[PDB]
Amino acid sequence: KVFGRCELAAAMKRHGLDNYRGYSLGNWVCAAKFESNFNTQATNRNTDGSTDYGILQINSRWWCNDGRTPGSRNLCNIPCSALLSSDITASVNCAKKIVSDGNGMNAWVAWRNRCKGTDVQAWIRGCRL
């Protein structure tokens, strides 16, 4: 599924991401835009052989099991394919654990490089929430 920008903002708000750990909704929409272009089916392989999954590009090195990242962990206790569903619940629940692990949203490179320090409220402008 390829979300509309306001559609995704509304789905994230319902799932408790607005203000989660102090990160307003615009930050999460911004990160999703640049990580996956709002596409739940996005996958990208990393140099170390791990893969990033889903609309927040969660990494199999630490967070999910894809059966092909030797020596990796599965801290979110999920198959990585659950991160590609049209239902964003599993991605959101796992992102909540990531952003709480001490490093906030700096875990998402695109957030650090393209959202941090910008007017992220622009990403939820005009949406009915």
User: Is 52 tagged catalytic?
Assistant: yes
Minimum distance from CB of 43 to Na ion (Å)? 14
Q: Out of Na ion, Cl ion, none, which partner does residue 26 contact, by CB within 5 to 8 A per kind?
A: Cl ion
Is residue 51 a contact point for Na ion (CB under 5 A)?
no
Q: Which residue is nearest to Cl ion (CB)?
A: 26
Minimum distance from CB of 10 to Cl ion (Å)? 13
Alpha helices, DSSP H, located in the chain: 5-14, 25-36, 89-99, 109-114
The rounded distance, in Å, linking the Cα atoms of 27 and 100 is 15
Rg (CA), the chain: 14
The rounded distance, in Å, linking the Cα atoms of 103 and 30 is 18
Which residues bind to Cl ion, rule: CB under 5 A?
A: 24-26, 109-110, 113, 120-121
Asked whether 105 and 93 are in contact (CB, 8 A), the reply is no
Minimum distance from CB of 8 to Na ion (Å)? 25
Q: Out of Cl ion, Na ion, none, which partner does residue 41 contact, by CB within 5 to 8 A per kind?
A: none
Q: Name the binding residues for substrate.
A: 101
φ/ψ of 87, rounded to 5, equals -85, 115
The rounded distance, in Å, linking the Cα atoms of 80 and 104 is 21
Is residue 60 a contact point for Na ion (CB under 5 A)?
yes
* Residues near Na ion, by CB under 5 A: 60, 65, 69, 72, 74
Q: Point out the residues that are catalytic.
A: 35, 52
